[PDB]
Amino acid sequence: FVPNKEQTRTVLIFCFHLKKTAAESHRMLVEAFGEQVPTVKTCERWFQRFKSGDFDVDDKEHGKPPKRYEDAELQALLDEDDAQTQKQLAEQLEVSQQAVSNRLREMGKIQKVGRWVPHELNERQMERRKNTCEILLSRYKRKSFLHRIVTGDEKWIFFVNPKRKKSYVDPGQPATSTARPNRFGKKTMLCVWWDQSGVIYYELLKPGETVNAARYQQQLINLNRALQRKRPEYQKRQHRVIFLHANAPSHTARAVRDTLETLNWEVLPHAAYSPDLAPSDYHLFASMGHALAEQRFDSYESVKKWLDEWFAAKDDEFYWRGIHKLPERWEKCVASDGKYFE
């Protein structure tokens, strides 16, 4: 009925503690469970190991084939090139693909996708960015000027922004498919300026309408009006407002370049290809990106009506937080020697 290599050795422990002999136990063993029991020679050996003081009922580790390549030998490949295929590594290790699968899960390794990054910068752009951030930081060290900062940027809002569905289902079964987004589709073109205390002023352009040097100039003033009545502490300190914006063509034309001299603001330095230093981009629009995902607008009216609901829901401190992230981002901008950071 009840033999078992593990159970048998347990019985040998029991006999040995009762102080019975090796051979005697082997007779009691055969008396209980019949002939199929082991030899006395093993009982003697097991007893031998008990006299040593080692009551482990499991085997010691058997012999095994030699490793065809070392763990640190694989890691050396990944050091030079983070991202290769299993079959690419397997090929370099004179081994099969699935062997490499195993070693990878055996080591601490997982597969995670790379980050997209805005642009392929040169040493040129990197030095500019680095220096700008170096400059903006040193000033913040002396005097914290973020309370004075007002920023804005412009962002397309598509009427239909479908996200790919991801469904929970039994293997081999098809998941829910979604229709692709046709680039040439209805899209308003939100323009928005804001500060640490909230959103100041925004214009949602009509389908297809955009921003030329004339339209922007007209916006800067429409802003300053709404800014005067929204921010009391401004009318006196009309020269103390710090303006942060993108280096677009309509953001440099004479007609506008002028309008900022007459408004008498301080245009903040903003390096080339630097969305990661642009509050509106990394914080405001980022947040929005989520809220917009798989959201569907039929008419401009609903878009403008959605914007308003959104902007309102947001607490003042959300925007505050976005602005007061500039310092830490500058600390990374510099630390990374001008490259993009996480």
Place this chain on the structure above:
Amino acid sequence: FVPNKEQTRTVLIFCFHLKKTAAESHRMLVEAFGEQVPTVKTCERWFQRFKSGDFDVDDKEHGKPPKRYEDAELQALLDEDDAQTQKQLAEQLEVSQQAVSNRLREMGKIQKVGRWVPHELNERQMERRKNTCEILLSRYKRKSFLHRIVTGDEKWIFFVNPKRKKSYVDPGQPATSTARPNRFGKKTMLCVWWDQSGVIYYELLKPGETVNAARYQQQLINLNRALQRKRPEYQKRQHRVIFLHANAPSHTARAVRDTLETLNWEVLPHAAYSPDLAPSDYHLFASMGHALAEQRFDSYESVKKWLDEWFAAKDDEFYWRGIHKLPERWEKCVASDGKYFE
């Protein structure tokens, strides 16, 4: 000092098979290991179970808490909408998100991202496809004409095709990042026509150049001329040519529409928004897509050279299979009611 619930119960199997008494075994037990051993009452019990026949060393299933929901309750949720989040399913079951993660592993379930499908068809756009397939089948069934088929479309070839990187590394470590593709970067349009016996004629337009109804007209002759050299069997059968091409605007302007009548080619019916019935798309370009991935070009020259080598590498079997995938795709087209099929 080697007691253990499993081991101890194993010892009572031994004493029992040595036809000793319950209170006997107990004494030997306390004699062997020490006072840290079960009471006689338990030995009396375990003996009872050895008389029924059962020698199960492990316990029977203990008391356990009641299931808050059921496995088919959750499956109902997935049957109506299979692509919810765990929190969303949890919410409906008055249970935590985590509690759902598990039950989903417990059941056979895995998460998988759905497929992109090129457009959102409406009933009219659907039935159009269904009908055009229905008809093309009914003809094929009668007589195979794919041998006469000669299709062709056009496709952009960016000079830089960057693809997101996938690295192997320890949890919480950065992966190899990639600089985004420049929408308005160098690209050459490729215009190519082919048939089951292989590529017939192609033109690689220069950076920025585009097909205008006049150009397409010219192209159709250059094709035709190139066609009768490469395909002998059309000198004789000069009206047998079947022509499958996209419903573009250049492909309908009268200047062209005449040219096709003067050449006297049977133009094949093609439904709108149906690149999944267009060999040039779903087969010939689909292949390139992989071959192009992570490939970089520097000059118009480099691309032209690569194309050739690629067209040569392709054995004639390839071109044949793409064309004769038609009847399959039609038959699925019509079966899915004009909807897209995977």
Place this chain on the structure above:
DNA sequence: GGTGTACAAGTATGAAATGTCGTTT
């Protein structure tokens, strides 16, 4: 910048499994 999924550690369930101790064999 926000969200989704799956690890890690705590609580409570509740039928085994177990100690007590006078009673029956």
Place this chain on the structure above:
DNA sequence: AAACGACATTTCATACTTGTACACCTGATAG
């Protein structure tokens, strides 16, 4: 002694909870 019979007291997977780690998402740019 030897084993039961009721009645009390501890085990321990289990079906959840909460806390937390962390992939991967979101915004881009300039023209």
Place this chain on the structure above:
DNA sequence: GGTGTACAAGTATGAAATGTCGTTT
């Protein structure tokens, strides 16, 4: 259909574990 990963069986490793003997406590 193309490419990449991971599951499922199959196969030889090779030191332990076990057996078989003629020896010595």
Place this chain on the structure above:
DNA sequence: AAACGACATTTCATACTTGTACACCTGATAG
């Protein structure tokens, strides 16, 4: 007898190998 030394035989978790199964890619549209 009861246990040891050699010397020959069987185990069994490994480290790999084919075959798969199967997730996700890749081509888009028309104005």
